[PDB]
Design a protein around this ligand. Sequence first.
Ligand SMILES: *[C@@H]1O[C@H](CO)[C@@H](O[C@@H]2O[C@H](CO)[C@@H](O[C@@H]3O[C@H](CO[C@H]4O[C@H](CO)[C@@H](O)[C@H](O)[C@@H]4O)[C@@H](O)[C@H](O[C@H]4O[C@H](CO)[C@@H](O)[C@H](O)[C@@H]4O)[C@@H]3O)[C@H](O)[C@H]2NC(C)=O)[C@H](O)[C@H]1NC(C)=O
Ligand SMILES: CCCCN(CCc1ccc(Cl)c(Cl)c1)C[C@@H](O)COc1ccc(NS(C)(=O)=O)cc1
Ligand SMILES: *[C@@H]1O[C@H](CO)[C@@H](O)[C@H](O)[C@H]1NC(C)=O
Ligand SMILES: *[C@@H]1O[C@H](CO)[C@@H](O)[C@H](O)[C@H]1NC(C)=O
Ligand SMILES: *[C@@H]1O[C@H](CO)[C@@H](O)[C@H](O)[C@H]1NC(C)=O
Ligand SMILES: [Cl-]
Ligand SMILES: [Cl-]
Ligand SMILES: [Cl-]
Ligand SMILES: [Cl-]
Ligand SMILES: [Cl-]
Ligand SMILES: [Cl-]
Ligand code: NA
Lengths: 358, 360
Amino acid sequence: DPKIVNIGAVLSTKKHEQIFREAVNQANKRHFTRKIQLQATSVTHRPNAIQMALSVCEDLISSQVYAILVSHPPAHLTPTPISYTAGFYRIPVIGLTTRMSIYSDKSIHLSFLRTVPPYSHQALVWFEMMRLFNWNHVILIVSDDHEGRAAQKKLETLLEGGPKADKVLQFEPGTKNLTALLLEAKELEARVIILSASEDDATAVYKSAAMLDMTGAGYVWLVGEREISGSALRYAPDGIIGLQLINGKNESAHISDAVAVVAQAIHELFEMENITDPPRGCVGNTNIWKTGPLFKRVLMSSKYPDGVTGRIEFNEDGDRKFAQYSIMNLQNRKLVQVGIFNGSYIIQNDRKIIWPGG
Amino acid sequence: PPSIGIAVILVGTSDEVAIKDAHDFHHLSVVPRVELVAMNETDPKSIITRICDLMSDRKIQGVVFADDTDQEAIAQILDFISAQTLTPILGIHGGSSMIMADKDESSMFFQFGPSIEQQASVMLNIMEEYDWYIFSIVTTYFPGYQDFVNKIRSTIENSFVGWELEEVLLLDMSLDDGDSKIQNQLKKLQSPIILLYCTKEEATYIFEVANSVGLTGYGYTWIVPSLVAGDTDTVPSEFPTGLISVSYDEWDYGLPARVRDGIAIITTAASDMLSEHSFIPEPKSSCYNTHEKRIYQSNMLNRYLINVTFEGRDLSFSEDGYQMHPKLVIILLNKERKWERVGKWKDKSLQMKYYVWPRM
Ligand SMILES: *[C@@H]1O[C@H](CO)[C@@H](O[C@@H]2O[C@H](CO)[C@@H](O[C@@H]3O[C@H](CO[C@H]4O[C@H](CO)[C@@H](O)[C@H](O)[C@@H]4O)[C@@H](O)[C@H](O[C@H]4O[C@H](CO)[C@@H](O)[C@H](O)[C@@H]4O)[C@@H]3O)[C@H](O)[C@H]2NC(C)=O)[C@H](O)[C@H]1NC(C)=O
Ligand SMILES: CCCCN(CCc1ccc(Cl)c(Cl)c1)C[C@@H](O)COc1ccc(NS(C)(=O)=O)cc1
Ligand SMILES: *[C@@H]1O[C@H](CO)[C@@H](O)[C@H](O)[C@H]1NC(C)=O
Ligand SMILES: *[C@@H]1O[C@H](CO)[C@@H](O)[C@H](O)[C@H]1NC(C)=O
Ligand SMILES: *[C@@H]1O[C@H](CO)[C@@H](O)[C@H](O)[C@H]1NC(C)=O
Ligand SMILES: [Cl-]
Ligand SMILES: [Cl-]
Ligand SMILES: [Cl-]
Ligand SMILES: [Cl-]
Ligand SMILES: [Cl-]
Ligand SMILES: [Cl-]
Ligand code: NA
């Protein structure tokens, strides 16, 4: 009989729980499991944060989970309570579909990896596009929140580490009518505009930019995913270019890849000596899982090349590397894929890009 | 006057009798009905279920919390509970009062003890007193470390004094140290003064490593904040004699007096709001229904909680949730491995015991 090693998961539906079970079952078939054998333990999201935190203790940590997969529910319910409660013990949490950049902050989320990249990493794709289409002068407009500043920081790092940002403009989140801000951008000579903003904030920008005739010929608009989503898409100027993370919302796909990565890391962990078990339950336990930090390092440096969502590696923030994006272009008010970022390379397809105006 | 429920939660041995004594000298618009509660555990579940049970079995307007641990996580658990239930919580002693940087936007959690920025400035005052102008900084990723470094940098770059910040080390204690990474980072240190921002548990490991590479002996002076010294009756063996710490762990401001001030703050704030709006926030009937009743709740009571004066003493909190004017005590770990009073920080002025540091 082998040593049973529980893996935890907080997932959207029972359908996804079963997918998690089968994924762990396959890992056990795939691996040599005479010594070590994985067991799946899962719940679905609780209706509020406090209940969710308690469930992590009662349902997962009570089973001595070595790690916890977490999906982003699609219905105000974040992985945060799970990151917190697990982080208390240094039990690693693997985010499946959460994109917000704040989860890359080690101070707040001190044992958190994810198989999808934060929105801010869309700057990586923008940069390659600026090289490709030789946009050597760009204007960067970002919302003055964590996400907006995260994108600015990431792009500026790439630019300071060729093309240059002629100016950066920040606006207050929730500001309808941004004429003042956009007038400042209009003056400048550069006419390639990059935007990071929430759905509603992007809508405001788009509308104001239209009244200022900055969405016509001569201009280029390069944005991310939130900015061509929902209501933002409703008022987006034709010719705009945006992004869509391939498989970004496929919880099933990420469960597969995450389980594979965790299984591989666990078998690698037990090659080392002096591996201690995670605490059984929360009650009466206030010490960290001593082996937690080691297991985090092992996960961080895990490589899974043949993943459903592509090549799986993590950067120094535990964020997904080699993510794949659909390069979208709004033509005749229809989102059209004009290429993909395959993780390291831009690949233009045979569909021709139509810029703002032309 | 109507009565508001205030739960006072005590973790670890404590003179309940002496605590009930230091406390109905209220002739306000509202009077406190306090309830002493003993707790044995300080894990997430125990703390959450306990406070939630209190809130469902009784009408709690606010919580006064005190523990005897060095567990800074407790503060972070309380802030979470506070924000989610929108209930005022005062961390007045122990881990509950250990600096909690970046409290939630909806938090109503307030702590006794100095802010990060104030401690940083107190340290520079100490260094100025003894003309220690050359130093380096070591922090972990423990929340607040940026505020600490920034505060230091902001102060010294805006002064004509010859400060020389040589090195700033950022240690990642979320990964293991089998590759001797932290040892390699510490070996870069050369300054005679080292400011260390981290937790008590983190400090004990960092000192162990620092000792191995000869950075704790004579010639090196380390200065840490309150939460590293924590409970000054518990002195890890890795802590180097000569360690200096800003502290607030119960020297002149006893637990009884704190519990009495905590009850006062909450009660006064409710009285003030009632006298101005003719209503106070209704105690949450449960934690397990917060998602529904959030459009009906608010951290309105905060604006009153931070501006209370009692018995002619200003008990104001910062908007960041810290004590405004705490009398801080500078302490030194002496040859007998005992923490020793060696200065006081009062009226934004530093009064040190020694002009020249005796030998430790
Ligand atoms: C995203 O897209 C990129 C680019 O298309 C992919 O990266 C390429 O991956 C392919 C493998 O499919 C590599 O092809 C190999 O190139 C080798 C030589 O590479 C040198 O020269 C190229 C061209 O200048 C440079 O880009 C590169 O940096 C090197 O300097 C060849 O030697 C290989 O041939 C060998 O294998 C074949 C089998 O197919 C045999 O038939 C041959 O005999 C020989 O043994 C091969 O052609 C290519 O080098 C990669 N390019 C770059 C830029 O890295 C990514 O793989 C793709 N990502 C994903 C996730 O799909
Ligand atoms: C803002 C809330 C943070 C929560 N915290 C875990 C503790 C805690 C807090 C709230 C709850 Cl509800 C629970 Cl259950 C548990 C995680 C984080 O605050 C850890 O704190 C530190 C961060 C970094 C370091 N240093 S490092 C990254 O080098 O190892 C040390 C501690
Ligand atoms: C999601 O990924 C799975 C593979 O795990 C695949 O079977 C399915 O077709 C994908 N769904 C979508 C909508 O792409
Ligand atoms: C861990 O190492 C210690 C030596 O200090 C040894 O006593 C113990 O058996 C080891 N355990 C494992 C599982 O390696
Ligand atoms: C704490 O322990 C003491 C005795 O050790 C016991 O009397 C008390 O009931 C315990 N408190 C709780 C909340 O269980
Ligand atoms: Cl439990
Ligand atoms: Cl194309
Ligand atoms: Cl208890
Ligand atoms: Cl919170
Ligand atoms: Cl502190
Ligand atoms: Cl600690
Ligand atoms: Na991370």
